[PDB]
């Protein structure tokens, strides 16, 4: 019914985004069928001076769009969910309504069009298509990948949502149609602003100029194709013959056994810079140099020259080092530093995907022994370094395949820096290209299990003064499958435990805060939006054989079967557990967020959110600390202790 | 004269500058300074340009209420509930320590609830000849909140286009829980409007006093409004809907009774006679059902049941009608002319053709003297309760 | 002081032997269990129900009709028994409802046996702030009350007294348009006051039970009370 577009004619790919981002715009609106436009709409259109064209039927609207795109002749079309729903809707409408000259949507003349990113890319020949969803998923990690969450996070602005049901009601007044049109225009502006802020186009151009593939394939994501073309260019340049196209499996990293508990003294953390590429460059690991046929091959002779693989990975490493030097500069704009961080993360992922493509069974350059050898050498390096650091009368408490955590047990900063420098020199003396650096110095650290620890990182400012920043790794507070209530309570508990107060006061503070939470949850003063659980779907909702026992797919079939926009693979679903009164299990009582404020018989299940959402997080967090137990938390929250542990009378 | 919306942005700067009664608006909401931050915890909502609806705003004193809102110039102002903390700092408050504590008892009457009885105007507009139905509502509720419940401090304000709001602000009323508000709303509700059901008023032989004194009041205005002014018994589709409420067994006699007459007065007389004849041989109080279903006040549950629900503040300017929301004089409710209510354009014209008492030189003085009387009366209870 | 029915607040401060400590708990459990049988096997109005329940109350030395002054011992027995039983039946949610239902039934029985005229002082002795009306006031509003009456048949305003209550406390009544409201005060028949008394007792009982459960770990530290807190459903 409504389509709005914005156009810029001098967008530069070798310079920052233009300000303002747009120079032209237009919009078209049409009536559905049975209804009619509210009267005096033309007079209001002339009054407000809006570049809007009113059409008679849908066919005229399609003709207007296909005629306008020819005159504008865009080269990059950016949108949201273009590859999933929008383009299919447009193409199917063209076919069913018999629009003229569909080949105007691309840049080539054709006769018959295929249907279902293969079909879309074929139908849009000659024009790049950019989807903010794919690029955002590739560059930034968020909780949900809809338009609202992206606008909330990237742009820091709230966006109004118009439901499907209310569309019929707003056909009565001219102002309501104007509001709909303005909302569509605002959505287009938000999409353009997100694209300009993420700097998607320069990164895509740089990656395509590095790998050498086609630019349109870069914007669709995926890491195998770039590596395939990169290795193809590398081998063709040196007069080779490449394999023809096709018409767990090996040992990985080593993680040390941790020492669970709480640490008040300073902790050093030593980390390797670009471990696996450094190994490849160090031991001349390449296709030409290593013999092959689950067996680990032997290292090659050191006299032979460098192979194809390390020379190509060296360039990526050097580019990342170049970006970090620019990052080092002082007095930089806050947005520029984030753009550089995204750039270096993308380059790091490109460098580390070259190793991953060696173990992909469908890759054009599949070679298991090479990955097995690099993993074996990584494990050997980790073990040797751990032995050498233990030899110096020092303690190691954790390490994950490239890192070592040392408990210095001191309290002065200068000496711990000196010890870190000494160990750094001792480690770096052995190897040629590999290097080790002090990633950070911790103040207080709570280590729960493997890959689970919270800490305070010491950030120096000037003249020996230092601040502390809280960081988390692997806890339940950083995952998307837990309610915001439990995450906030866990964050409060972590903040209390890691403080400098006495161990006596923290228990009392936790008790008071837990009692307040227990009262407030039953009272009902907490908003509904904090009871949501978000889960991602891997397969299509109709394809799940166990649909009954899984809550999120159960909500997904409902939202597909009654609602509008259809959720597909990769999308996220939000569900809340409520009281139905049918005496089924908790996992079979999931309901949509909009299903609670519309119906009357449903109410929030406080027992589930108070005995299975809050309690497990605070019970797992406070395990290494004394004075707090599961039964005490159960009593504090107002629960029945009989379930958790009790038993003996 | 017709109000011009296009000049609304220009006049709004002047009205908020020299006409808005700031002193009494602050003295009312501060409630005598007895409570430690009773004003600083109040939620105001402002409707700015471009249809921007911002919800949480707070103020520190009179000076902030002056300068902050002068720099904004909102189209509409709404007053919320007194929250536990300052509403503008709601982002940083604790997880669940933010909840409402007190609010006045608000009652809203909307003209759109009388669409199935109305035969003259549109759903969104009014005419003089039917506006009396509004007063027929007030005298039913005004008595009910005065004698039955004993509430003393009530303010009746013109909504601006199609209703009158009632604020109850007695000291005990402001702290009532939601259940008591729902109950007091139910006690005043009689017309059970279903899914477009013809019959919406039901009763038994036993008569509650609240539903009998209401009949005693409605009898005074029924003959003037329904039988002469409304004249709902003139042609076939005028009394077919009336007969729909009546059991079909009497339609045969009633059609012949209404057929040979000329105006609604004898229509009502014959209808009463036949209804009494039906009662004698069979009670259901047929003659009262039609009056109660055509004329009893209807209230919205949603506007009043909640504790944090926003409502338009007095002395605001409606974007369309331009009329200032003015209080009603309780002792001359029958002497109120809706179309006499001054417009922002008219008062601005008066001000242009002219310690700050410039509202006294404008026609707004008689309509703010009632506000001053309300505050003076409330101060009487203030000093009679605490000091005695 | 009206030791024949009492809202249980102001926990006691006396000290007792442990044998009496266990005997009080077991006797209260026995009586409260037999209330279940009496309420299940019979109906709430037969003379046999009253006779059996009062005979059992006499058997276990528990308070009943107030016409014989100094039964201080049954008063003390019941006062200690309720508080000692509060600790046990506050653990599981299947036992809290069982406690509340049968205690409310017992209070209903104790209320039904007050003769006619000691009720007024009791209402003031439980912090309830209720009032009665004289005969002249009853005659003044006779027609108004009988018109405001519920589906109760007949216009005869019997000898049952009419009570005067703040309106906010009669939410369950004036919501249904079944009472008379005047000057912010509700007028109710004596039959319906039982419902509001029990409804207001229930909330306080539940609040007391909840506040005891969370401060009950401190009491488990005593080694002499472990058998009692775990073997009252054994
Ligand atoms: N996304 C990934 N895909 C494939 N391999 C990965 C990925 N992330 C990490 N690895 C492997 C290869 C890396 O050499 C090794 C250690 O990674 P990590 O500690 O994140 O950084 P890094 O050692 O490459 O250096 P840097 O600290 O400079 O980013 O783990
Ligand atoms: Mg590293
Ligand atoms: Zn009218």
By C-alpha distance, the chain B residue nearest C179 is: B208
Q: Give the number of B-C residue pairs with CB atoms closer than 8 Å.
A: 38
The rounded distance, in Å, linking the Cα atoms of A306 and A313 is: 12
**Measured distance CA(B132)–CA(B130) in Å, rounded:** 5
- Report how far apart, in Å, the C-alpha atoms of B133 and of each of B125, B200, B332 are: 14, 18, 15
Nearest CA-CA partner of A342 in A466, A202, A439, A472: A202
Task: Please check whether residue B51 touches A, CB under 8 A.
Answer: yes
Query: Burial code of B90-116, b = ≥16 C-beta within 10 A, e = fewer?
Result: eeeeebbebbbebbbbbbbbebebbee
Q: Which token pair is C52?
A: 């059996």
Give burial (CB, 10 Å; 0-12/13-18/19+) of B281: exposed
Structure tokens at A505: 């006061």
Distance CA B292, CA B222 (A): 10
Long-range contacts at A194-198 (CB < 8 A, ≥ 24 apart): A194/A132, A194/A136, A194/A150, A194/A151, A194/A154, A194/A155, A195/A78, A195/A130, A195/A132, A195/A135, A196/A17, A196/A21, A197/A17, A197/A154, A197/A155, A197/A335, A198/A132, A198/A135, A198/A136, A198/A139, A198/A140, A198/A154, A198/A342
Q: Which residues pair with A269 in a beta bridge?
A: A405, A440
C-alpha to C-alpha distance for B222 and B133, rounded to whole angstroms:
9
Token pair for residue A114? 């295929």
Measured distance CA(B65)–CA(B21) in Å, rounded: 12
Burial environment of residue C106 by CB neighbours within 10 A (0 to 12, 13 to 18, 19 or more): buried
Quote the CA–CA distance of B161 and B338 in Å, as a whole number. Answer: 9
SS (H, E, C) A307-324: CHHHHHHHHHHHHHHHHH
Residues facing A271 on adjacent strands: A403, A437
Q: Which residues of A144-180 are buried (b: 16+ CB within 10 A; e: fewer)?
A: bbbbebbbbebeeeebeeeeeeeeeeebeebeebbeb
For strand A572-579 and strand C162-166, is the pairing parallel, antiparallel, or unpaired? Answer: unpaired
CA angle at residue C204 from C203 to C205, to 5 degrees? 90
H-assigned helices in A74-146: 87-97, 118-123, 132-139
Vertex A240 angle, CA A237 and A243, to 5°: 115
**DSSP string covering B242-258, please?**
HHHHS-GGGHHHHHHHH
Long-range contacts of B30-33 (CB under 8 A, 24+ apart): B31/B382, B32/B379, B32/B382
Question: Which residues contact residue B315 at a Cβ distance below 8 angstroms, ignoring those fewer than 6 apart?
Answer: B20, B21, B25, B324, B325, B326
- Which CA distances in Å does A308 have to A213, A360, C107? 19, 19, 92
CB contact under 8 A, A525 and B51: no
Structural domains in chain C, sorted by start: 7-230 (1.20.930.80)
Q: Could you tell me how many helices (H) and strands (E) chain B has, helices first?
A: 13, 8
DSSP 3-state of A335: helix
A277 C-alpha vs ligand 2 centroid, how far in Å?
A: 11
- Helix axis angle for B286-295 and B264-281, nearest 10°, is 130
Tell me the C-alpha distance between B100 and B79, whole Å: 13
* Cα–Cα nearest to A144, from A595, A576, A533, A547: A533
- SS3 call for B63: helix
Which are the catalytic amino acids of B?
Answer: 43, 108, 110
Number of structural domains in chain B: 1
Whether C163 contacts C132, CB under 8 Å: yes
Token pair 């005629």 is found at A67
Closest CA to B338 of B160, B189, B187: B160
Closest listed residue to residue A92, CA positions, set A67, A74, A108, A115: A115
Taking the C-alpha atoms of residue B155 and residue B28, their distance in angstroms, rounded to an integer, is: 12
The answer to whether A458 touches A286, Cβ cutoff 8 Å, is no
How many angstroms separate the Cα of A309 from the Cα of each of A251, A280, A306, A315?
Answer: 21, 8, 8, 11
Residue A17's CB is within 10 A of a number of other CB atoms, namely: 18
Paired residues of A446 in beta bridges: A262, A454
Q: How many CB atoms lie within 10 A of CB A134?
A: 22
Is the distance from CB of A407 to CB of A397 less than 8 angstroms? yes
Contact yes or no for A99/A62 (Cβ under 8 A) = yes
Q: Ligand 1 site: residues with CB under 6 angstroms?
A: A 271-276, 348-349, 352, 355-356, 402
Residue in C147, C175, C182 closest to B183 by CB: C175
- The answer to whether the CB of B324 falls within 8 A of the CB of B315 is yes
Could you tell me if B104 and B306 are in contact, meaning their C-beta atoms sit under 8 angstroms apart? Answer: no
* C18-41 vs C47-59: helix crossing angle, rounded to 10: 170
Resolution reached, in Å? Answer: 3.6
- Phi and psi at residue B262, in whole multiples of 5°? -130, -30
Cα separation, B219 vs B193, whole angstroms: 23
Q: Whole-angstrom Cα distance, residue A33 to residue A58?
A: 9
Domain holding B43, by residue range, is 1-388
B165 assigned ligand-binding residue: yes
- Which among A348, A352, A381 is the best mutation to test ligand 1's pocket, defined by most ligand atoms within 8 Å of the CB? A352
Residue from A276, A320, A360, A400 whose mutation best tests the ligand 1 pocket (most atoms within 8 A of CB): A276
Helix axes C93-112, C47-59, angle to 10 degrees: 110
Is residue A358 within 8 Å of residue A365, measured between CB atoms? yes
CATH number where B342 lies: 3.90.920.10
B312 annotated to a ligand binding site = yes
B149 contact residues in C (CB cutoff 8 A): 167, 181, 184
Method of determination? cryo-EM
Q: CB-based burial of residue C23 (10 Å sphere; 0-12 exposed, 13-18 middle, 19+ buried)?
A: middle
Dihedral pair phi/psi, residue C90, rounded to 5°: -105, 5
Q: Does B99 touch chain A (CB under 8 A)?
A: yes
Q: Cβ atoms within 10 A of the Cβ of B271, count?
A: 23
State which residue of chain A sits closest to B101, comparing Cα positions.
A525
Which residues, in sequence order, are CB contacts of B281 under 8 Å at separation 6+? none
Listed by the residue before each break, gaps in chain B with C–N over 2.5 Å are 282, 354
Q: Residues in chain A, how many?
A: 649
C203–chain B Cβ distance below 8 A for any pair: no
Helical residues (DSSP H) of chain B, grouped into ranges: 8-18, 22-30, 62-70, 128-143, 178-187, 209-222, 236-245, 251-259, 264-281, 286-295, 301-305, 344-352, 365-385
How is residue B327 annotated by DSSP?
Answer: B
């Amino acid at each position: 019914i409504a389509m709005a577009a914005l156009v810029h004619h001098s967008f530069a790919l070798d310079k920052a985004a233009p300000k303002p981002p747009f120079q032209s715009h237009f919009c078209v609106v049409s009536k559905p069928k049975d209804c009619i436009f509210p009267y005096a709409f033309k007079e209001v259109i002339e009054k407000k001076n809006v570049k809007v064209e009113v059409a008679a039927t849908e066919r005229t609207l399609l003709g207007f769009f296909l005629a306008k795109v020819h005159k504008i002749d865009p080269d990059i079309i950016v949108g949201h969910n273009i590859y999933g729903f929008e383009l299919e809707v447009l193409l199917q409408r063209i076919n069913v309504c018999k629009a003229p000259h569909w080949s105007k949507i691309g840049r080539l003349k054709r006769s018959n069009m295929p249907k279902l990113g293969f079909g879309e890319r074929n139908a849009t020949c000659g024009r790049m298509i950019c989807d903010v969803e794919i690029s955002a998923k590739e560059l930034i990690r968020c909780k949900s990948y809809h338009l609202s969450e992206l606008v909330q996070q990237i742009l820091k602005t709230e966006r109004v949502v118009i439901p499907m049901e209310n569309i019929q009601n707003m056909y009565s007044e001219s102002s309501q149609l104007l509001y709909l049109l303005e909302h569509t225009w605002k959505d287009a502006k938000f999409i353009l602003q997100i694209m300009c802020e993420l700097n998607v186009l320069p990164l895509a151009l740089q990656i395509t100029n590095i790998a050498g593939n086609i630019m349109s394939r870069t914007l669709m994501g995926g890491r195998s194709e770039r590596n395939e073309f990169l290795l193809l260019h590398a081998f063709y340049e040196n007069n080779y013959i490449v394999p023809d196209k096709q018409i767990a499996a090996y040992a990985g990293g080593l993680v040390l056994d941790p020492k669970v508990g709480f640490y008040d003294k300073f902790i050093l953390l030593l980390d390797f810079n670009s471990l696996y590429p450094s190994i490849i460059q160090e031991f001349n690991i390449c296709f030409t140099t290593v013999q092959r046929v689950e067996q680990i091959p032997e290292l090659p002779d050191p006299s032979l020259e460098m192979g194809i693989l390390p020379r190509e990975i060296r360039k990526l490493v050097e580019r990342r080092k170049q970006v970090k030097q620019l990052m080092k500069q002082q007095d930089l704009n806050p947005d520029l530093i984030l753009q550089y961080d995204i750039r270096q993360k993308a380059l790091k992922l490109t460098a580390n995907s070259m190793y991953g493509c060696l173990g992909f069974s469908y890759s054009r350059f599949y070679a298991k022994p090479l990955a097995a050898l690099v993993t074996y050498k990584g494990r050997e390096i980790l073990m040797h370094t751990k032995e050498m650091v233990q030899k110096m009368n020092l303690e190691v408490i954790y390490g994950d395949t490239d890192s070592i955590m040392i408990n210095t047990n001191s309290t002065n900063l200068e000496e711990v820096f000196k010890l870190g420098n000494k160990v750094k020199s001792e480690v770096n003396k052995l190897y040629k290209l590999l290097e080790i650096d002090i990633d950070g110095v911790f103040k207080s650290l709570l280590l729960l299990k493997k890959k689970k620890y919270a800490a305070l990182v010491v950030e120096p400012t000037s003249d020996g003064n230092y601040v502390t920043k809280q960081e988390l790794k692997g806890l339940d507070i950083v995952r998307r499958d837990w309610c915001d209530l439990a995450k906030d309570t866990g964050n409060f508990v972590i903040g209390q435990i890691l403080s400098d107060q006495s161990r006596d006061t923290i228990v009392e503070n936790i008790q008071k805060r837990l009692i307040e939470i227990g009262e407030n949850v039953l009272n009902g003063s907490v908003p509904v939006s904090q009871f949501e659980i978000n889960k991602a779907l891997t397969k299509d909702p109709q394809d799940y054989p166990d649909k009954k026992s899984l809550p999120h797919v159960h909500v997904a079939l409902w939202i597909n079967s009654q609602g509008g926009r259809k959720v597909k693979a990769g999308d996220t679903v939000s569900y809340v557990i409520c009281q139905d009164g049918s005496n089924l299990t908790a996992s079979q009582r999931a309901y949509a967020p909009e299903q609670l404020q519309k119906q009357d018989n449903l109410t929030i299940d406080t027992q589930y959110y108070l005995a299975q959402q809050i309690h497990p997080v605070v019970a797992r967090i406070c395990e290494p600390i004394d004075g707090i137990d599961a039964v005490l938390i159960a009593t504090w929250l107002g629960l029945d202790p009989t379930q958790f542990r009790v038993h003996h009378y | 004269e017709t109000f011009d919306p296009t000049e609304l942005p220009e006049l709004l700067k002047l009205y908020y500058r020299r006409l808005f009664p700031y002193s009494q608006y602050y003295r009312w909401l501060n409630y005598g300074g007895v409570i430690k931050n009773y004003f600083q915890h109040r939620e105001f909502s402002f409707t700015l340009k471009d249809d921007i609806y911002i919800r949480y705003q707070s103020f520190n004193n009179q000076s902030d209420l002056e300068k902050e809102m002068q720099k904004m110039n909102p189209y509409k102002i709404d007053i919320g509930a007194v929250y536990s903390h300052r509403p503008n700092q709601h982002n940083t408050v604790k997880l669940g320590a933010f909840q409402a504590q007190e609010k006045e008892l608000v009652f809203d009457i909307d003209m759109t609830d009388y669409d199935d009885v109305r035969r003259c105007c549109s759903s969104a507009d009014i005419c003089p000849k039917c506006w009396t139905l509004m007063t027929m509502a007030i005298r039913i509720i005004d008595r009910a909140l005065k004698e039955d419940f004993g509430f003393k401090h009530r303010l009746w304000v013109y909504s601006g286009r199609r209703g009158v709001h009632c604020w109850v602000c007695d000291e005990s009323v402001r702290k009532l829980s939601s259940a008591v508000r729902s109950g007091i709303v139910e006690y005043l509700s009689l017309v059970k409007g279903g899914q477009d059901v013809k019959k919406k008023v039901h009763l038994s032989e036993k008569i509650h006093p609240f539903i009998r004194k209401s009949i005693n009041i409605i009898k005074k205005y029924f003959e003037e409004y329904a039988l002469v002014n409304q004249d709902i018994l003139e042609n076939k589709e005028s009394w077919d809907k009336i007969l729909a409420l009546v059991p079909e067994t009497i339609h045969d006699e009633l059609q012949q009774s209404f057929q040979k007459s000329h105006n609604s007065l004898q229509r009502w007389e014959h209808l009463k006679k036949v209804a009494s004849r039906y009662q004698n041989n069979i009670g259901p109080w047929l003659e009262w059902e039609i009056m109660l279903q055509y004329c009893f006040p209807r209230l919205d549950i949603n506007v009043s049941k909640g504790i944090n629900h926003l409502l338009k503040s007095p002395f605001s300017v409606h974007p369309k009608t331009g009329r200032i929301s003015v209080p009603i004089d309780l002792q001359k409710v029958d002497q109120f002319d809706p179309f006499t209510v001054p417009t922002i354009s008219f008062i601005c014209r008066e001000l242009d053709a002219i310690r700050t008492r410039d509202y006294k030189k404008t026609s707004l003085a008689p309509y703010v003297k009632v506000f001053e009387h309300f505050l003076e009366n409330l101060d009487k209870s203030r000093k009679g309760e605490l000091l005695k | 002081y009206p030791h024949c029915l009492q809202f249980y607040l102001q926990p006691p401060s006396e000290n007792i032997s442990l044998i009496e400590f266990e005997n009080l708990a077991i006797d209260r459990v026995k009586l409260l269990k037999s209330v279940e049988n009496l309420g299940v096997s019979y109906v709430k109005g037969t003379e046999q129900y009253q006779s059996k329940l009062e005979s059992e109350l006499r058997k276990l030395k528990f308070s009943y009709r107030e016409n014989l002054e100094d039964e201080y011992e049954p008063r003390r027995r019941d006062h200690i028994s309720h508080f000692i039983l509060r600790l046990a039946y506050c653990q599981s949610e299947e036992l809290r409802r069982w406690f509340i239902q049968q205690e409310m039934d017992l209070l209903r029985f104790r209320f039904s046996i007050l003769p006619k005229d000691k009720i007024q002082d009791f209402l003031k002795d439980s912090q309830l702030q209720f009032e009665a009306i004289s005969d002249e006031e009853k005659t003044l509003r006779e027609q108004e009350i009988v018109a405001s009456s519920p589906s109760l048949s007949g216009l005869k305003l019997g000898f049952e007294s009419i009570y005067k209550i703040p309106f906010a406390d009669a939410l369950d009544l004036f919501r249904g348009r079944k009472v008379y409201l005047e000057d912010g005060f509700a007028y109710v028949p004596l039959k319906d006051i039982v419902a509001i008394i029990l409804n207001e007792f229930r909330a306080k009982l539940s609040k007391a039970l909840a506040l005891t459960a969370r401060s009950l770990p401190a009491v488990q530290s005593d080694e002499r009370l472990q058998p009692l807190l775990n073997h009252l459903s054994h």
